[PDB]
RNA sequence: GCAGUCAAGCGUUCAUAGCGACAUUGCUUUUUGAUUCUUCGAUGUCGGCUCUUCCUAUCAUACCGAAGCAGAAUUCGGUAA
RNA sequence: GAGAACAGAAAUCUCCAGUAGAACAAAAGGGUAAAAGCCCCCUUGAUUUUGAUUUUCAGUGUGAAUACAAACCAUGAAAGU
RNA sequence: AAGCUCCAGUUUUAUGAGGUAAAGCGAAUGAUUAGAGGUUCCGGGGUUGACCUAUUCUCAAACUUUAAAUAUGUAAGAUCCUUGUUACUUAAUUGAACGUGGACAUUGAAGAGCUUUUAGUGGGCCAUUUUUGGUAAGCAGAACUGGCGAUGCGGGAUGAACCGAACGUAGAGUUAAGGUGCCGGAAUACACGCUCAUCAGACACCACAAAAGGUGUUAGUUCAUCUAGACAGCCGGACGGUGGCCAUGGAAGUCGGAAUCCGCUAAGGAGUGUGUAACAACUCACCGGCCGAAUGAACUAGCCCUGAAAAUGGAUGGCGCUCAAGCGUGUUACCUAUACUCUACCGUCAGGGUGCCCUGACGAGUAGGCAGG
């Protein structure tokens, strides 16, 4: 697409880390990203998260990137979703219609802030989970779209400009 | 160069990568690198230091 | 104004020992003599009552200047001011404990010393370390000269 | 009592200060007891356990401690009666409140000199709850969950800390903890 | 000084007609303290008189709510300077 | 703790168990178990001289202290102290 | 200043140390407390065995030591050999370590050493962080640091110490901070979402607004119920084992206190509330219909109002717009300092070169020193 939204970097590494039997073992975060300024700092943020590294550590083997593979077209995005407001972060599904992984992170911003509190400082989420266009469950926006491959219903929704013509 | 190797070795590397978490085992890059450092704040509110 | 300043004020976690150091120092300790410069930590046993430097000296590392009877004479530096002296302490060897630190320094040093002298004859590892060394130098080697020059800066102009 | 709001006590003042030499005649401990109800009986009868919970970082007046706890009391013993279930209070109260007692009017200001001056004279104790800790460990049976749940209500409005009901887990849940015989 | 919350309790019975502790959060700046910012080549003191303009937390009047308002004296409270 | 008529304050003496919770004139805190503590003897070095140095105080005195060497003795097996 | 003379730092290594949380010692409020040995008294009964204290294994948090502190600033610390000759403390005894004399072989960059003489104090302030006293304070009194003082200029309505920025002159360019409806550079920008109170145009700030927070505002979450038909409302039905043991004046559906099976079976509970001294009805449970699609309860956060009262006259700097000119999420383009770069050039210092010419760097300034005029 056109200046992104965030695609999601797969980004893989190591550690990688000290004369011991040891090492630290394989491992994966696909993040959601603008690039490798935000490749790397997702990756320190899970390592504190999850695992606790170090940043040292912490070695990243390869990037590789994400455009749209499916599809441009028809997730409604099950997101798992952390929000900071008047204290920490509080757990979240939220399951809302899109367009695509880029579109899902601006919509999921713009209910963080708005709806709920948010501001500076976040971060993220957790995952996010496609599912069947049927299957859709909470509820508003989607509900109608769902109802729309079905269709008939696309003849509905049909709506928006209206009012406007005469014919 | 260096990212030949890893070409060359994995089929396996990407796809699993893009869609799940996990990584595979065989191979591994360093890297070295060196740096350009530019001074962008000024001198004002900090300790000499 | 009110209180004192006062030598033994501020001591309890620097005087006392861990429950493993507690029980009375064992005699080989005090037995002990030293050479000159030989590099010894100064702190303090909680369990020797006497021969105990100020206490504010503690934690300081210095090299064995001269002996003078049981105790020895360290050589030190404090910190703050304007044309700060170096000072003698007479400190005792309870308190003085050796540094381990310089001693492996010393051996590798000394160890990559011999593997060089064999690189020197039939070899070459380096170049440019091996030009100013041959060049360079007496002094003999060993003087007192060069320890102003190293008093001159611990009086810093900017801290000040 | 006297008053002073708790504008004066609840921001985290002091380096504490309860200590036992340097504070002859401080005024009383009121919490009448802090465990309450069933003391003659173990945790392990009650399927259920609530607490009360702080979102603030703060300093609780006794007066507030034993206030809140005895309006949750009452409508504990009121509605469960008298031989009802058990309650532990989380956090005892000491920590020593220093605060000057009204000087006088001769022109004799403080008359002390001008003054105030340390060692000042005991207003009697408060507790530290600082935020996340639990002020009130309750046990019960589920048949009576809404009466400790409103008896933790009327309790809030007696302390000036904002807090949170919430169901506990611990050490297990009630029922991984009990396998082993 | 005044207000809000909570409402133990009292009001024959009845939390809330009315009264209302403990606790607790506020607000004002008009008492008192605290301070030492301002003025020691100088800000005339209290009080009173008289002239003005204001404020709302309203004592009365207007309009209203509730009552443990039969009338009716009334009580409490809202709007309102 | 036990044990012993009487004795409670009851020493007392006895046995076991007893690592710094005791003792160490005096604050505080620290510190130590054939100890620097406890006992028995013997004794005077609580001597004179000079004091490297630190604390005083980073350079500033008195004072203090930590070390000597000369001078002199002690105890002690003696080293030493 | 005036001269003299030609080294500084830092990761990394090693040391020991702030601290403050949960144990140990000591103190210990201070509960709750089972199990369980023993105090000591009397006092009743058939050694046992009611009665008070109290070890002992054993349980909720505080506080001063200490482990391990975790931390973090720190915070000092970074030549060798042989030969001879001398010494030395310590048995006519054993050794080293001294000193010499001689030979042998070894990431940084001017931040910089010393001296004479000189001056203004020898009253500070603010902020940030860590505090200590104080209810607090445009408070008091420390620590660590930057600024103000003594520091312009640009931003912020104004405004010593907030941000950007450290300033010879002059110009051109481009930027910071921060801003782009108008005042007012520069967008009535682009994608979206909430809000309708004029919330609101606000980093810090004499910028207020809380407990309580409602809440069926919006949103989000967690648990349950729904096409097998929930839900609002309206409508509608109930025979039989059998009026159930205990206790008491008395419970018998419904003062207190049990079990809880079953008929048949749209369905008909040993019962939901309303009762009388006690008994004495009627509804509901449970079940059915008329309608048709979501539903309600708990928490959380935006918003918001409610909490929300003050004195000479209305403001967020002002006008005052409200799918924004709000506020939040992303994002494009612009604007904008003495900054930064560059051009020209004045001083100092590097220096060079021939009373003179040239190269490049640095270059605000009160107290104040010195030097030229």
Redesign the pocket.
């Known amino acids: 697409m056109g ?3 965030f695609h999601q970097y797969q980004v893989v590494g190591r550690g990688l880390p000290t004369p011991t039997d040891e090492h630290p073992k394989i491992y994966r975060m696909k993040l959601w990203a ?1 690039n490798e300024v935000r490749a790397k700092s997702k990756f320190w943020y899970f390592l504190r998260k999850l695992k606790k590294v170090k940043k040292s550590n912490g070695q990243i083997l390869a990037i590789n990137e994400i455009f749209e593979k499916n599809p441009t077209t028809i997730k409604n995005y099950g997101i798992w ?1 952390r ?1 900071q ?3 920490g972060y ?7 219609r899109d367009t695509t992984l880029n579109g899902a ?3 999921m ?12 400082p ?1 971060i993220q989420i957790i995952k996010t989970a496609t599912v069947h266009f049927k299957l859709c469950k ?3 926006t989607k ?1 109608f779209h769902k109802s729309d491959i079905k269709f008939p219903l696309v003849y509905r929704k049909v709506r928006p400009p209206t009012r406007k013509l005469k014919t | 160069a260096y990212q030949k190797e890893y070409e060359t070795a994995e089929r396996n590397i990407i796809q699993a990568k893009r869609d799940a978490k996990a990584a595979g085992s065989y191979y591994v890059e360093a890297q070295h690198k060196l740096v350009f450092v530019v001074r ?10 | 104004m009110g209180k004192s ?4 004020s501020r ?15 064992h005699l080989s300790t005090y037995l002990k003599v030293y ?3 030989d ?1 010894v ?3 303090a ?10 206490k ?8 064995v200047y001269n002996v ?4 020895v ?1 360290v050589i ?17 060897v309870e308190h003085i ?1 050796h ?4 001693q ?3 051996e590798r ?2 160890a990559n ?1 011999a593997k ?2 064999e690189a ?1 004859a039939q070899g070459v590892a380096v170049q440019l ?2 030009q100013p ?2 060049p ?8 007192e000269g ?1 320890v ?12 000040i | ?11 985290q ?9 340097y504070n002859r005649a ?1 005024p ?2 009121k919490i009448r ?3 309450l109800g069933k ?4 945790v392990d009868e009650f399927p259920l356990c609530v607490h009360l919970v702080s ?1 603030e970082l703060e300093q ?2 006794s ?2 401690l ?3 706890r ?2 949750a009391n ?1 409508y504990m013993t ?1 509605v469960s009666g008298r031989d009802a279930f ?1 309650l ?8 020593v409140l ?3 007692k009204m ?1 006088s ?1 001769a ?1 004799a ?2 008359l002390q000199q ?7 004279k005991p207003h009697g ?1 408060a ?2 709850v ?1 935020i996340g ?2 002020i009130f ?1 309750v046990r019960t049976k589920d048949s009576n969950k809404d009466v400790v ?1 409103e008896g933790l ?2 309790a ?10 919430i169901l506990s887990k611990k050490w297990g849940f009630t029922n991984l903890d009990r396998p082993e015989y």
């Open positions: 200046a992104f939204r603008t979703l929000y407001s008047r204290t509080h757990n979240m599904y939220k399951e809302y992170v601006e919509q911003y713009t209910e963080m802030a708005s709806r709920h509190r948010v501001r500076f976040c909470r509820d508003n509900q | 962008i704040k000024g001198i004002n509110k900090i300790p000499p230091k | 300043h006062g030598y033994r001591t309890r976690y620097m005087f006392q020992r861990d429950f493993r150091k507690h029980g009375a120092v050479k000159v410069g590099i930590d100064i702190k046993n909680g369990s020797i009552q006497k021969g105990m430097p100020h504010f000296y503690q934690g300081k590392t210095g090299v003078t009877k049981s105790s004479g030190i530096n404090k910190m703050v001011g304007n044309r700060y002296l170096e000072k003698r302490l007479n400190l005792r404990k540094s381990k630190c310089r492996e320094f010393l040093v000394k010393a060089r002298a020197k370390k091996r060394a041959q360079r130098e007496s002094r003999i080697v060993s003087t060069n102003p020059q190293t008093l001159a800066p611990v009086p810093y102009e900017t801290f | 009592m006297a008053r002073r709001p708790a504008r004066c006590y609840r921001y003042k002091n380096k504490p200060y309860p200590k036992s030499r401080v009383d401990s007891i802090y465990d003391k003659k009986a173990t979102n609780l007046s007066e507030a034993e206030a809140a005895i309006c009452k009121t058990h532990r209070v989380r956090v005892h109260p000491f920590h220093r605060i000057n000087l009017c022109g200001d403080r001008g003054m105030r001056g340390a060692w000042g104790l507790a530290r600082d800790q639990i460990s749940v209500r009327r809030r409005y007696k302390f000036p800390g904002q807090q949170k009901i």
